[PDB]
Design an enzyme around this catalytic site. Sequence first.
Site, PDB file in Angstrom:
ATOM      1  CG  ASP A  32      -1.873   1.016   0.903  1.00 17.02           C
ATOM      2  OD1 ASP A  32      -1.706   2.230   0.919  1.00 17.02           O
ATOM      3  OD2 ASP A  32      -3.148   0.627   0.761  1.00 17.02           O
ATOM      4  CB  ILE A  33       1.258   4.077  -2.404  1.00 22.15           C
ATOM      5  CG1 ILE A  33       2.609   4.964  -2.792  1.00 22.15           C
ATOM      6  CG2 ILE A  33      -0.347   4.717  -2.304  1.00 22.15           C
ATOM      7  CD1 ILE A  33       2.038   4.799  -4.705  1.00 22.15           C
ATOM      8  CG  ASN A  88     -12.012  -0.232   4.247  1.00 20.91           C
ATOM      9  OD1 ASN A  88     -12.521  -0.869   5.606  1.00 20.91           O
ATOM     10  ND2 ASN A  88     -10.358   0.314   3.742  1.00 20.91           N
ATOM     11  N   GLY A  94     -15.136   3.738   4.787  1.00 19.11           N
ATOM     12  CA  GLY A  94     -13.914   3.914   3.925  1.00 19.11           C
ATOM     13  C   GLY A  94     -13.253   3.658   2.824  1.00 19.11           C
ATOM     14  CD  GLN A  95     -15.195  -0.891  -1.881  1.00 15.54           C
ATOM     15  OE1 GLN A  95     -16.411  -0.842  -1.434  1.00 15.54           O
ATOM     16  NE2 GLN A  95     -15.047  -0.585  -3.329  1.00 15.54           N
ATOM     17  CG  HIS A 101      -9.202  -3.118  -1.915  1.00 13.73           C
ATOM     18  ND1 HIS A 101     -10.078  -2.350  -2.214  1.00 13.73           N
ATOM     19  CD2 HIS A 101      -8.388  -2.020  -0.737  1.00 13.73           C
ATOM     20  CE1 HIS A 101      -9.803  -1.260  -1.742  1.00 13.73           C
ATOM     21  NE2 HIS A 101      -9.641  -1.084  -0.846  1.00 13.73           N
ATOM     22  CG  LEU A 102      -7.323  -9.744   2.677  1.00 13.81           C
ATOM     23  CD1 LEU A 102      -8.966  -9.779   3.859  1.00 13.81           C
ATOM     24  CD2 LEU A 102      -7.156 -10.526   2.727  1.00 13.81           C
ATOM     25  CG  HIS A 103      -6.407  -2.396   3.731  1.00 12.75           C
ATOM     26  ND1 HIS A 103      -5.513  -1.674   2.913  1.00 12.75           N
ATOM     27  CD2 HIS A 103      -7.897  -2.400   2.443  1.00 12.75           C
ATOM     28  CE1 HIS A 103      -6.405  -0.472   2.653  1.00 12.75           C
ATOM     29  NE2 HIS A 103      -7.489  -1.062   2.537  1.00 12.75           N
TER      30      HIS A 103
HETATM   31  O1  LIG Z   1      -8.834   1.667  -0.257  1.00  8.24           O
HETATM   32  C1  LIG Z   1      -7.449   1.594  -1.170  1.00  8.24           C
HETATM   33  C2  LIG Z   1      -5.910   1.039  -0.855  1.00  8.24           C
HETATM   34  O2  LIG Z   1      -5.493   1.509  -2.010  1.00  8.24           O
HETATM   35  C3  LIG Z   1      -4.268   2.388  -1.806  1.00  8.24           C
HETATM   36  O3  LIG Z   1      -4.083   2.312  -2.823  1.00  8.24           O
HETATM   37  C4  LIG Z   1      -5.134   3.174  -0.568  1.00  8.24           C
HETATM   38  O4  LIG Z   1      -3.849   3.665  -0.004  1.00  8.24           O
HETATM   39  C5  LIG Z   1      -6.395   2.286  -0.134  1.00  8.24           C
HETATM   40  O5  LIG Z   1      -5.639   2.593   1.415  1.00  8.24           O
END
Ligand SMILES: OC[C@H]1O[C@@H](O)[C@H](O)[C@@H]1O
Lengths: 115, 115
Positions: A32-33, A88, A94-95, A101-103
């Site tokens: 994640d950037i 999300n 907060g999506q 996508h899975l954080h």
């Molecule tokens: O929600 C998408 C996520 O991808 C990343 O590119 C952003 O920082 C964000 O946290």
Amino acid sequence: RPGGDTIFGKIIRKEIPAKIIFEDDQCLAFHDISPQAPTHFLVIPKKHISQISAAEDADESLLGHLMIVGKKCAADLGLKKGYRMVVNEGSDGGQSVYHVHLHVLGGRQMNWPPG
Amino acid sequence: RPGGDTIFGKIIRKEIPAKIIFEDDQCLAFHDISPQAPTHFLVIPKKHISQISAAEDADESLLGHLMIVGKKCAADLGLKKGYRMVVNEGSDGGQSVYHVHLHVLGGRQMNWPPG
Ligand SMILES: OC[C@H]1O[C@@H](O)[C@H](O)[C@@H]1O
Ligand SMILES: OC[C@H]1O[C@@H](O)[C@H](O)[C@@H]1O
């Protein structure tokens, strides 16, 4: 297009660079950037699913596969003391990108509530 | 035993009461007794998997199934503006019960970082 029309689609097609950790026939993991922990990466499906609310019953395995890849990448990145996985959905969740996508965050103590 | 030896096992076997939302052959969803949002419930597998780090490749569908049930229950509980799904692993992730569980929170704006 394949891969969707969001920035994730550009990453999947390699139109824009990313710090890719792992990639298989179903998904891709990359850092994640804007990390919120020492280690913060995402695991995204190559199939475009806009939101978790729109996933169908048949996407069950694929969704489960993102979590398996996530735990494998977390172990490979040295997160042996633990981590937190997060999905999300919508405005309230907060999506920010409309591609499922899975954080995965770790490398620090995660607090509660989870936001 | 079946269902595990944690409190979740007691809930699954109905040895102790819970506010159960839905139940199928693979999982059960029930409200969290210490909610961190207006709506905060958990979806747990009936198969005892201690931690997400110990899930095997074959648990892929089952893990994906917890997310499908989660989104279905969220819609049924009226979380149309969104929600956040969370899986905690180990000490750093804040995992308090050693039986894999998926948190689903909504009914309020979820903030970032997710803890
Ligand atoms: O929600 C998408 C996520 O991808 C990343 O590119 C952003 O920082 C964000 O946290
Ligand atoms: O981590 C397990 C969760 O189950 C609930 O019983 C607790 O409040 C906790 O949030």
